[PDB]
Every structure is written in structure tokens, then in C-alpha cells.
Amino acid sequence: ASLSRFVETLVVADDKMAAFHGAGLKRYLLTVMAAAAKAFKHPSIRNPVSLVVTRLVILEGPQVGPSAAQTLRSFCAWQRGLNTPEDSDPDHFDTAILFTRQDLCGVSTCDTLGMADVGTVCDPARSCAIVEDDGLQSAFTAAHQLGHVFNMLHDNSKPCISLNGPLSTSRHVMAPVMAHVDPEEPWSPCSARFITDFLDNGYGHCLLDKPEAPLHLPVTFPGKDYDADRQCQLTFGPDSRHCPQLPPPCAALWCSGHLNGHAMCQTKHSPWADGTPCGPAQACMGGRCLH
Ligand SMILES: CC(C)C(=O)c1ccc(OCc2ccc(-c3ccc(S(=O)(=O)N[C@@H](C(=O)O)C(C)C)cc3)cc2)cc1
Numbered sequence: 001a002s003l004s005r006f007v008e009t010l011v012v013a014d015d016k017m018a019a020f021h022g023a024g025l026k027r028y029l030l031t032v033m034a035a036a037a038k039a040f041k042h043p044s045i046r047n048p049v050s051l052v053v054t055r056l057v058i059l060e061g062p063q064v065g066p067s068a069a070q071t072l073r074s075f076c077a078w079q080r081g082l083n084t085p086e087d088s089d090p091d092h093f094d095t096a097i098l099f100t101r102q103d104l105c106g107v108s109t110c111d112t113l114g115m116a117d118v119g120t121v122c123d124p125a126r127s128c129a130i131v132e133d134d135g136l137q138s139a140f141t142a143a144h145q146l147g148h149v150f151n152m153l154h155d156n157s158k159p160c161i162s163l164n165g166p167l168s169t170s171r172h173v174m175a176p177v178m179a180h181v182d183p184e185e186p187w188s189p190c191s192a193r194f195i196t197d198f199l200d201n202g203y204g205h206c207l208l209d210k211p212e213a214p215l216h217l218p219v220t221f222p223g224k225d226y227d228a229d230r231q232c233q234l235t236f237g238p239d240s241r242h243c244p245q246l247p248p249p250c251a252a253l254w255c256s257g258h259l260n261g262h263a264m265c266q267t268k269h270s271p272w273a274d275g276t277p278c279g280p281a282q283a284c285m286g287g288r289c290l291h
Pocket residue numbers: 035036038039068106111112113114115116139140141143144145148172173174175176177178179180181182183186286
């Protein structure tokens with residue numbers, strides 16, 4: 001029997017998150033975590049994993065700069081101070097994730113969206129992730145980052161090529177770059193095998209207890225909590241509205257912006273959030289306008 005697992009999570013938001021989101025931050029973080037939690041409940045992962053928020057902190061803490069490698073190391077040694085000796089104590093957490101509006105930047109480019117060391121979930125000193133918040137898509141960056149935390153590699157790594165098969169495209173969470181993920185199958189057979197093996201070898205021992213009193217994650221669709229306009233505001237800023245699009249609805253969110261004193265449209269190529277209205281009795285699901 002495949003034992004159910006609970007990831008008791010500390011959600012930390014920073015200096016820059018608070019300025020951007022203001023009063024709307026706590027609700028926003030929960031919407032994001034609700035989505036991350038949903039990716040992990042998908043049968044593709046072939047394991048029962050409940051991503052549960054037990055503590056949420058809004059910020060004197062970690063050093064947050066452009067270097068992603070540096071910000072991660074800082075947050076990981078900081079987080080450790082908020083932890084507790086035993087997992088009996090309702091204040092203990094199994095994983096820590098920081099969210100920042102800071103443009104996190106790797107060794108070559110700034111396209112980096114987050115960072116985590118691989119296979120650390122039950123090491124309270126290493127169980128760590130940082131995420132660059134560029135709107136609701138950050139839920140996806142989070143799911144990916146926790147993927148790493150759960151010992152998964154990218155889908156183009158040598159071991160994955162073998163398990164994924166010669167026909168595997170980049171439509172999965174553990175793609176090396178941001179990808180449109182298969183709603184029918186978010187996790188590659190590689191991802192499922194790596195987490196499976198990771199848990200069967202006892203590296204998830206800290207995940208067996210059920211959380212004392214978890215924060216209440218919303219049940220609604222992200223595209224209902226936040227309409228197209230709010231989603232544009234979340235990615236590009238408060239003055240940004242949805243750009244009316246000719247019909248490929250749901251596939252890509254296009255937003256307004258201002259360059260030289262006239263309007264223009266802008267995109268990070270991310271889909272409209274799940275549940276966003278796209279017609280009379282229709283909403284976006286996985287990049288498609290369904291009934
Ligand atoms: C809708 C449902 C299926 C779901 O909730 C869902 C879940 C996840 C998802 O997105 C997939 C996804 C998300 C993020 C990434 C991704 C890709 C690259 C990077 S990165 O920062 O450039 N690389 C870092 C990394 O590999 O983690 C390096 C720098 C350490 C960071 C994140 C790659 C794929 C999309 C949807």
C-alpha cells in the first residue's frame with residue numbers, strides 16, 4: 001500500500017512582494033500554493049502527495065539579490081532559524097519556499113525563474129526553494145522547484161531520455177525551460193520514477209505525519225480569483241489591462257503596456273489561468289477554451 005504523504009510548508013514572501021501586492025498578498029500566495037498543490041495531486045506523479053501550507057511569513061531576514069545561487073543559500077540558512085527540533089511540534093515544517101518580485105538571475109542570463117537543490121525534502125537544513133514571482137505562472141515555477149526538492153531531474157537529462165522514451169516532447173513540469181504542460185499528464189514517467197524511488201528509499205520519512213492545522217487553501221479556479229485584467233496587472237503592473245485578442249483564446253495572455261506615449265501589447269507567452277472566462281459558458285483549461 002502506497003502511504004499518503006504531507007509536505008508541511010513554510011511560505012515566505014519578501015520586501016518586494018509586499019510592495020507590489022500590498023494588501024492582496026496573503027490571498028495571492030494561497031491562490032498560487034493552491035495551484036502548486038494541485039499539480040502534485042495528479043495521478044501522473046504516481047504517488048499521494050499533499051502540499052500543505054502550515055506557516056506563512058511576510059517580511060529582517062534573507063539577503064535577496066540578483067544572484068539566484070546566492071539568494072537560495074541565504075534563505076536556506078535563514079529559514080533554519082524558524083524551524084524546530086522535532087516534527088511532533090505543530091510549528092515544524094518540512095520544506096521552505098521564498099517568493100520574491102526580485103528579478104532572479106542565473107550565471108549566464110536573467111531568464112532564470114527559480115532555484116532549488118535536488119533531493120532535500122527531509123533535510124531541514126537543505127529543504128529549500130526560491131521563486132521569482134512574475135504572476136500566477138509562479139505556481140508552475142513552484143511545482144517545478146519542489147520537483148527538484150523531491151529529487152527529480154530535468155526531462156532532457158541523460159537518465160530521463162531513457163525513461164521518457166524517444167518520442168517525449170517538452171510538455172511536462174520538469175522541462176528545462178518554461179513549457180505548456182499537458183493537463184492530462186503534467187509529470188513525465190521520469191519524474192514519477194525519481195520521486196517513487198526517492199520515497200521508497202526512505203528519503204521522505206519526514207512526510208508521514210498529518211499536519212496540525214493547515215492554512216486554508218482556496219478551492220476556486222485561479223482564473224476566477226483573478227480575471228484577465230488582474231492577471232495582466234499581476235505580471236506587468238497595475239496599469240496593465242488585457243489586450244483584446246483575435247481568436248486563439250486561452251493559449252497566450254497578451255497585456256497592455258506603454259512605450260513612447262502610446263499603447264502596445266506585451267506577453268510572457270504564458271496561458272490564461274485555469275478557469276478564466278473565454279466566452280458565454282466557456283473557461284480556459286490548460287490553454288484551451290473549453291465548455
Ligand atoms: C495546470 C497544471 C498541469 C499545473 O499546475 C502546472 C504545473 C507546472 C507547470 O509548469 C511547468 C514548468 C514550470 C517551470 C519550469 C522552469 C524552467 C526553468 C527554470 S530556471 O530557473 O531557468 N532553471 C533553474 C531550475 O532548473 O530550476 C536553474 C537555474 C537552477 C525554472 C523553472 C519548467 C516547467 C505548468 C502547469
